[PDB]
Amino acid sequence: IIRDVELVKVARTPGDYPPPLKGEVAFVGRSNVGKSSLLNALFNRKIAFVSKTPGKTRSINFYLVNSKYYFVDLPGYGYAKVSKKERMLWKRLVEDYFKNRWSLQMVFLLVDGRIPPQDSDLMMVEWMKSLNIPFTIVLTKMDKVKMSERAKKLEEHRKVFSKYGEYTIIPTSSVTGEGISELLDLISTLLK
Ligand SMILES: Nc1nc2c(ncn2[C@@H]2O[C@H](COP(=O)(O)OP(=O)(O)O)[C@@H](O)[C@H]2O)c(=O)[nH]1
Incomplete structure (x- = not known):
């Protein structure tokens, strides 16, 4: 359960990071992938641009x-x-x-x-x-994935990413909330 969210560091140079505390997770992807939207869905508040x-x-x-x-x-x-x-x-x-x-x-x-x-x-x-x-x-x-195409597309991501290594794959939508609670739980587990 996320209670408080604070923007505390805008790191513009290497090594300008806050003290480690109890640990952290990071988010990254192609520009426009929906990262800010995902963060906001996770935080349950509009904070990322x-x-x-x-x-x-x-x-x-x-x-x-x-x-x-x-x-x-x-x-x-x-x-x-x-x-x-x-x-x-x-x-x-x-x-x-x-x-x-x-x-x-x-x-x-x-x-x-x-x-x-x-x-x-x-x-x-x-x-x-x-x-x-x-x-x-x-x-x-x-x-935005047609209900009739969801199966094919999910298998495709699974197939491709399985030739490599990974922790798991979680489908999400910041619009419907699909996967948001599942992602939150996994994060809480990793952190605690
Ligand atoms: N339909 C839909 N649009 C999304 C979703 N997530 C992000 N978007 C849109 O995709 C565009 C990029 O979003 P944004 O969060 O700024 O992407 P970022 O560049 O990765 O931070 C925006 O117009 C968002 O409204 C989503 O889960 N569903």
Whole structure:
């Protein structure tokens, strides 16, 4: 049960992270995948910025939850015409985070449920595997998947992500609430 959510750190440079406390989980995915919307659904409040147009990579944001854990919002990758400077910033921040944040318990990798897994997502998977970073796949935007196509598409994500490694796969919709409570429970378990 999430009681309190506070934005406490906007990290713009490597290593500018708050004290580890009791642990944390992180969220990442392609820009526009629905990360801010998912965070808001999890927090049960509008706090992360939602938009049809993806924001530039600028920071890693730390949300202090119940005064003892963090939900960490990593910047989205790909999509926009990411300039050299922006991708370098992206790489610089996320790599620093992965390599140095020992208290990270789990990364939730958000991917669009509506289409099959894509190359940049698979690259993300390979990278975290190489860094020994645990991760769980979260499918987003499930409310837009035709009921008659849900089975095929879910199997496709399962098949693809099984050729690799993973913690589990949770379909979600920030619109209907599908999977939100299941994701919350898994997080509570990982943290406690
Ligand atoms: N139908 C639907 N739209 C969503 C869902 N999640 C996000 N969106 C929309 O997708 C667009 C991107 O959302 P956003 O949360 O800002 O993505 P972000 O760039 O990953 O943080 C927005 O227009 C959202 O309204 C979802 O579960 N269902």
